[PDB]
């Protein structure tokens, strides 16, 4: 029978500058190992900004210049979940964060709000 | 280097098309010999349904020995349940039939804001009558008068003699079950010869283009 395809982000919240947060992305309907997965963020004014990605079938990671050294993407294939570890948060990191998987096209979740004082 | 724009898979063109087919004349687009467009993105807000049967959607990335068929059309909200294996009803029987052993994905979204109009949008049609049920993936675009009684019709409409296509009337004030939904069915065609353009499941480094 069927399996719903869904990505559900969580772990956002309010933190004062210099703090840390770990976002989670629970995937349904596909094994996260089998897809290129990525985080992007949606800032109030700005357009979509890709921040981190991890390879299909492998461990190579990529990061936006703006988050290098601060953010780490990782994947737990047993929990079918991807994570974004965000350290030393700056107030212009404030945005809604989405996880996404490349399935012919990018398919993304619902978003989780992150606000840095 | 980088692929020609002619080599990008047209998934965006499927989901973003301005007009969709009537369900009786459902449209099939073959996706083949291409690689992913990393600019094309949808999220949970885009779709009300995204279910796959017997397959991970990551198979949409594997076109070296497979083509993808994207079948698309508009139906009512309360008919979307019929776009699934093992269903019966007006749509499954007479318009678009999935096989019991279907392998692939079904995507749908509410299109009230595009496909309904004040006073009704009547441009989307369905087949209401047919002598037999469709076989899986069969398509019928004939327009012969349907004989509902024992008296032959001889090509004229009357009681028990009906033109077989009928219009949805989509009004924006309809309840959600009577609002229009756009539907995309993704299925797979196994190939005997390798594609001229395609890409492996394991990343080759294309992710770097998101950070450029
Ligand atoms: C190809 O299609 C893409 C997908 O379309 C969506 O999916 C399809 C399947 C159908 O379901 C469509 O009905 C649906 O739109 C297009 O991308 C989409 O574009 C739309 C409109 O441009 C965009 O919707 C906007 O989203 C923002 C963000 O929403 C979040 O954030 C706010 C806070 O900021 C929050 O409150 C929300 O709850 C969300 O969490 C939203 O603010 C916008 O609101 C505006 O419109 C609504 C209408 O109801 C109105 O009430 C508001 O008051 C306000 O005016 C609006 O909802 C989708 O997010 C976006 N989807 C994705 C995945 O990107 C795509 O459009 C092109 O890209 C867009 C980014 C935009 O620039 C378009 O103008 C572009 O044309 C389209 N591509 C092409 C080439 O046409």
Author numbering:
A (entry chain A): -2 to 114
B (entry chain B): 328 to 539
Sentences from the paper on this structure:
A key step to the SARS-CoV-2 infection is the attachment of its Spike receptor-binding domain (S RBD) to the host receptor ACE2. S1 binds to angiotensin-converting enzyme 2 (ACE2) on the host cell membrane via its receptor-binding domain (RBD), causing conformational changes that trigger a secondary cleavage needed for the S2-mediated membrane fusion at the plasma membrane or in the endosome. Here, we identify and characterize a high-affinity synthetic nanobody (sybody, SR31) as a fusion partner to improve the potency of RBM-antibodies. In summary, we have structurally characterized SR31, a high-affinity nanobody against SARS-CoV-2 RBD.
To characterize the SR31-RBD interactions in detail, we purified the complex and obtained crystals that diffracted to 1.97 Å resolution. The asymmetric unit contained one molecule each for the RBD and SR31, indicating an expected 1:1 stoichiometry. SR31 binds to the RBD sideways at a buried surface area of 1,386.3 Å2 (CDR1, 204.5 Å2; CDR2, 226.8 Å2, CDR3, 519.4 Å2; non-CDR, 710.3 Å2) which is significantly larger than that for the previously reported sybodies SR4 (727.4 Å2) and MR17 (853.9 Å2). The binding surface is near a heavily decorated glycosylation site, Asn343, which, although at an apparent strategic position to possibly divide the accessible surfaces for immune surveillance, does not show clashes with SR31. Peculiarly, the CDR3, which contains a cluster of hydrophobic side chains that include Met99, Val100, Phe102, Trp103, and Tyr104, is inserted into a greasy pocket in the RBD that is lined with twelve hydrophobic/aromatic residues. Aligning the ACE2 structure to the SR31-RBD structure showed that the SR31-binding epitope is distant from the RBM. Structure alignment of SR31-RBD with ACE2-RBD revealed that the two RBD structures were overall very similar with a Cα RMSD of 0.45 Å. Specifically, the small α-helix α364–370 (numbers mark residues from start to end) moves towards the direction of RBM by a dramatic distance of ~8.0 Å and transforms to a short β-sheet (β367–370) which in turn forms a parallel β-sheet pair with β102–104 in the CDR3 region. In addition, nudged by the CDR1, the short helix α383–388 swings towards the RBD core by ~4.0 Å. Remarkably, the dramatic rearrangements did not cause appreciable conformational changes of RBM, nor did it affect ACE2 binding.
